[PDB]
Design an enzyme around this catalytic site. Sequence first.
Site, PDB file in Angstrom:
ATOM      1  N   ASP B 135       0.830  -1.198   0.000  1.00 39.31           N
ATOM      2  CA  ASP B 135       0.000   0.000   0.000  1.00 39.31           C
ATOM      3  C   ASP B 135       0.866   1.249   0.000  1.00 39.31           C
ATOM      4  O   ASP B 135       0.871   2.005   0.969  1.00 39.31           O
ATOM      5  CB  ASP B 135      -0.930   0.008   1.217  1.00 39.31           C
ATOM      6  CG  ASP B 135      -1.990   1.089   1.135  1.00 39.31           C
ATOM      7  OD1 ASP B 135      -2.290   1.539   0.011  1.00 39.31           O
ATOM      8  OD2 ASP B 135      -2.526   1.489   2.190  1.00 39.31           O
ATOM      9  N   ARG B 139      -0.293   8.938   1.490  1.00 41.88           N
ATOM     10  CA  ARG B 139      -0.946   8.815   2.782  1.00 41.88           C
ATOM     11  C   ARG B 139      -0.176   7.876   3.696  1.00 41.88           C
ATOM     12  O   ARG B 139      -0.367   7.903   4.909  1.00 41.88           O
ATOM     13  CB  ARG B 139      -2.373   8.303   2.618  1.00 41.88           C
ATOM     14  CG  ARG B 139      -2.445   6.862   2.176  1.00 41.88           C
ATOM     15  CD  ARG B 139      -3.876   6.405   1.987  1.00 41.88           C
ATOM     16  NE  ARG B 139      -3.939   5.189   1.181  1.00 41.88           N
ATOM     17  CZ  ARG B 139      -3.927   5.182  -0.147  1.00 41.88           C
ATOM     18  NH1 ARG B 139      -3.856   6.325  -0.816  1.00 41.88           N
ATOM     19  NH2 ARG B 139      -3.982   4.037  -0.806  1.00 41.88           N
ATOM     20  N   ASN B 140       0.680   7.037   3.117  1.00 43.73           N
ATOM     21  CA  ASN B 140       1.519   6.141   3.916  1.00 43.73           C
ATOM     22  C   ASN B 140       2.958   6.630   4.078  1.00 43.73           C
ATOM     23  O   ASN B 140       3.865   5.827   4.300  1.00 43.73           O
ATOM     24  CB  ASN B 140       1.507   4.719   3.357  1.00 43.73           C
ATOM     25  CG  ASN B 140       0.442   3.851   3.995  1.00 43.73           C
ATOM     26  OD1 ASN B 140       0.119   4.004   5.175  1.00 43.73           O
ATOM     27  ND2 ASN B 140      -0.117   2.931   3.214  1.00 43.73           N
ATOM     28  N   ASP B 153       3.380   2.254   7.309  1.00 46.73           N
ATOM     29  CA  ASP B 153       2.102   1.638   6.967  1.00 46.73           C
ATOM     30  C   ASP B 153       1.148   1.637   8.157  1.00 46.73           C
ATOM     31  O   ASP B 153       1.340   0.893   9.116  1.00 46.73           O
ATOM     32  CB  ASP B 153       2.286   0.211   6.448  1.00 46.73           C
ATOM     33  CG  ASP B 153       1.023  -0.343   5.798  1.00 46.73           C
ATOM     34  OD1 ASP B 153      -0.087   0.159   6.071  1.00 46.73           O
ATOM     35  OD2 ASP B 153       1.137  -1.294   5.004  1.00 46.73           O
TER      36      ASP B 153
HETATM   37  C1  LIG Z   1       7.415   0.499   5.632  1.00 44.13           C
HETATM   38  C2  LIG Z   1       7.209  -0.938   6.137  1.00 44.13           C
HETATM   39  C3  LIG Z   1       8.592  -1.457   6.537  1.00 44.13           C
HETATM   40  C4  LIG Z   1       6.610  -1.821   5.036  1.00 44.13           C
HETATM   41  C5  LIG Z   1       6.324  -0.923   7.357  1.00 44.13           C
HETATM   42  C6  LIG Z   1       5.918   0.041   8.253  1.00 44.13           C
HETATM   43  C7  LIG Z   1       5.072  -0.618   9.184  1.00 44.13           C
HETATM   44  N1  LIG Z   1       4.424  -0.103  10.305  1.00 44.13           N
HETATM   45  C8  LIG Z   1       4.220   1.242  10.534  1.00 44.13           C
HETATM   46  O1  LIG Z   1       4.579   2.108   9.737  1.00 44.13           O
HETATM   47  N2  LIG Z   1       3.580   1.661  11.693  1.00 44.13           N
HETATM   48  C9  LIG Z   1       3.334   3.018  12.007  1.00 44.13           C
HETATM   49  C10 LIG Z   1       4.074   3.759  12.932  1.00 44.13           C
HETATM   50  C11 LIG Z   1       3.773   5.112  13.156  1.00 44.13           C
HETATM   51  C12 LIG Z   1       2.747   5.761  12.467  1.00 44.13           C
HETATM   52  C13 LIG Z   1       2.492   7.163  12.736  1.00 44.13           C
HETATM   53  C14 LIG Z   1       1.370   7.922  12.426  1.00 44.13           C
HETATM   54  N3  LIG Z   1       1.674   9.169  12.894  1.00 44.13           N
HETATM   55  C15 LIG Z   1       2.917   9.115  13.436  1.00 44.13           C
HETATM   56  N4  LIG Z   1       3.452   7.938  13.361  1.00 44.13           N
HETATM   57  S1  LIG Z   1       3.468  10.621  14.086  1.00 44.13           S
HETATM   58  C16 LIG Z   1       1.901  11.336  13.576  1.00 44.13           C
HETATM   59  C17 LIG Z   1       1.508  12.644  13.748  1.00 44.13           C
HETATM   60  C18 LIG Z   1       0.243  13.008  13.281  1.00 44.13           C
HETATM   61  O2  LIG Z   1      -0.296  14.268  13.378  1.00 44.13           O
HETATM   62  C19 LIG Z   1       0.491  15.286  14.003  1.00 44.13           C
HETATM   63  C20 LIG Z   1      -0.298  16.592  13.878  1.00 44.13           C
HETATM   64  N5  LIG Z   1      -0.427  17.032  12.482  1.00 44.13           N
HETATM   65  C21 LIG Z   1      -0.250  18.490  12.309  1.00 44.13           C
HETATM   66  C22 LIG Z   1      -1.493  19.274  12.730  1.00 44.13           C
HETATM   67  O3  LIG Z   1      -2.666  18.736  12.122  1.00 44.13           O
HETATM   68  C23 LIG Z   1      -2.855  17.365  12.459  1.00 44.13           C
HETATM   69  C24 LIG Z   1      -1.696  16.569  11.878  1.00 44.13           C
HETATM   70  C25 LIG Z   1      -0.599  12.056  12.650  1.00 44.13           C
HETATM   71  C26 LIG Z   1      -0.208  10.728  12.470  1.00 44.13           C
HETATM   72  C27 LIG Z   1       1.049  10.410  12.947  1.00 44.13           C
HETATM   73  C28 LIG Z   1       2.007   5.027  11.531  1.00 44.13           C
HETATM   74  C29 LIG Z   1       2.313   3.676  11.309  1.00 44.13           C
HETATM   75  N6  LIG Z   1       4.983  -1.913   8.885  1.00 44.13           N
HETATM   76  O4  LIG Z   1       5.750  -2.093   7.758  1.00 44.13           O
END
Ligand SMILES: CC(C)(C)c1cc(NC(=O)Nc2ccc(-c3cn4c(n3)sc3cc(OCCN5CCOCC5)ccc34)cc2)no1
Lengths: 274, 274
Positions: B135, B139-140, B153
């Site tokens: 995916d 957005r990711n 993800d």
């Molecule tokens: C890539 C790979 C190896 C395949 C993989 C990854 C994986 N697994 C993952 O990637 N997991 C994972 C870990 C962290 C996040 C994540 C989401 N967010 C953060 N980390 S920090 C963050 C901050 C956010 O908003 C802050 C404020 N903003 C400004 C003001 O308006 C609002 C928004 C919103 C979402 C957000 C998502 C997924 N599994 O496999």
Amino acid sequence: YDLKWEFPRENLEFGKVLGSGAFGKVMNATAYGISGVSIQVAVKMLKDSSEREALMSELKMMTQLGSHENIVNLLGACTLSGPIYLIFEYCCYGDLLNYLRSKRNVLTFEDLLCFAYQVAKGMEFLEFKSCVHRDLAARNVLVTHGKVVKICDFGLARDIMSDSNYVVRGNARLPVKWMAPESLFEGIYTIKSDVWSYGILLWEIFSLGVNPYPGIPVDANFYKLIQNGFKMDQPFYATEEIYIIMQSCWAFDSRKRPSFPNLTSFLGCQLADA
Amino acid sequence: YDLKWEFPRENLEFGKVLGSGAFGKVMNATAYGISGVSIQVAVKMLKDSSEREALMSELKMMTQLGSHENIVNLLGACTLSGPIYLIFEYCCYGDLLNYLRSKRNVLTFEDLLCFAYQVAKGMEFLEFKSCVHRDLAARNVLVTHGKVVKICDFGLARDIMSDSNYVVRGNARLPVKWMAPESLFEGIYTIKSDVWSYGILLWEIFSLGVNPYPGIPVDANFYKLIQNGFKMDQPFYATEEIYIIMQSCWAFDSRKRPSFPNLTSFLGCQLADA
Ligand SMILES: CC(C)(C)c1cc(NC(=O)Nc2ccc(-c3cn4c(n3)sc3cc(OCCN5CCOCC5)ccc34)cc2)no1
Ligand SMILES: CC(C)(C)c1cc(NC(=O)Nc2ccc(-c3cn4c(n3)sc3cc(OCCN5CCOCC5)ccc34)cc2)no1
């Protein structure tokens, strides 16, 4: 026609023949006072008034053009008391197609990259000057000192009757394997038609002078192969990057191909890294 | 599962919710002694044993992976006395898709070029580690300090029931507009499938977050449009070079697409010039 071009034909000392055709030829010569005291030059001349103009039309076309480093540049001419001569810079290593074939001074990949770069530089110039080349191939590029390459056109100084790459199509003899689809099917020749040809020329460089679409003859199937979007596979001396670049020159839509400024940027990047 | 990952869950100080779905969520938290004295972290957790593993399978997958700068990196985990937590680096500016949309700190073309470069750096890493992302979209991808971007993800932390970009096809809900033809028509997912998605992600970046194939809905016609070789036109903030690169990611033959090492070289060149 500016007068500064007019050169004394008596100052020309003729040597061997560099190329010949049914219409005209290119002699090698020594010219005194056109540059040192004398230089080697290449001289275009004829051997029928329907072609006495085609040369004269080439004469005024080469003077309006202006010089570029990757173009065979005009130095002078003889057009008053006798047969017409056009005096060019001399490229001592002949055409690029043979140069590559004979190199199968040692040849490196970066040289290949440079050749490609300079040709795109030269076509970028022509694009800017609003010209098209109707016969862009490796055989129409010359090699000089310092691995410098210059785009040219033998035209009337090439024997197309005995060149198998010029195929009879309609009332003409055309370099089909180098031609874009719009050229083949609509008689259209633009700068983007040239881009397609440049893609084939890249293939020529990175195959080291192999005939395009090897093992494939020019018959009814070939035109339908091109029209159905057939593209050559990667040539032996191509990197992954170059092949992708090469492939973009072959977009069926002429609007989707890169411009020559684009190609120069793409290849400039590759040179800087390689 | 190595023991060095195990982090005291008591050292976690939970804040707001960063993302939610039907299966799980991502909380923001403060973690003491995982790095300064404490840092901001993002924590993945669930809210059914068929997904207690899908998380655990993500756990062992993120530890085997190793860190990269353009990947959301794992720091620790809680897997012994209670519910499972996976502790990641915190990216304070959220996902890239919203970041671009809200920027319509001032945003320059070179930033766009950098975003693209870093993502290709990150996918080059995954290619090397022999992973596919099923995916890959804007957005990711997350944005942190210093205009740094990290691939991630959300998976079980995204509500796909309410995301219109996930379309019901067969017995599943898929991000169709980002998917390669082999994925759509053969269920195949390779690194070159990812390359196609990367091409769409480029479009996302240089349109500043416009939905791919705008004005075109996902119906029977769309699948036949893709299958007949339809490609998007140039996005507003794309240069000529970038569009050509973008287009190579969309070769119908997956074998004809660039690798991520290729893409990094192509974009590295563009950065050096721009
Ligand atoms: C890539 C790979 C190896 C395949 C993989 C990854 C994986 N697994 C993952 O990637 N997991 C994972 C870990 C962290 C996040 C994540 C989401 N967010 C953060 N980390 S920090 C963050 C901050 C956010 O908003 C802050 C404020 N903003 C400004 C003001 O308006 C609002 C928004 C919103 C979402 C957000 C998502 C997924 N599994 O496999
Ligand atoms: C590009 C543009 C503007 C459209 C254009 C050009 C144009 N017009 C032209 O390009 N005219 C033109 C001018 C010079 C040459 C030409 C051919 N050769 C040279 N100049 S120097 C030379 C040297 C050669 O061999 C040397 C020995 N070699 C090594 C040993 O083995 C034998 C070979 C062979 C051919 C050759 C060709 C065409 N009209 O329009």
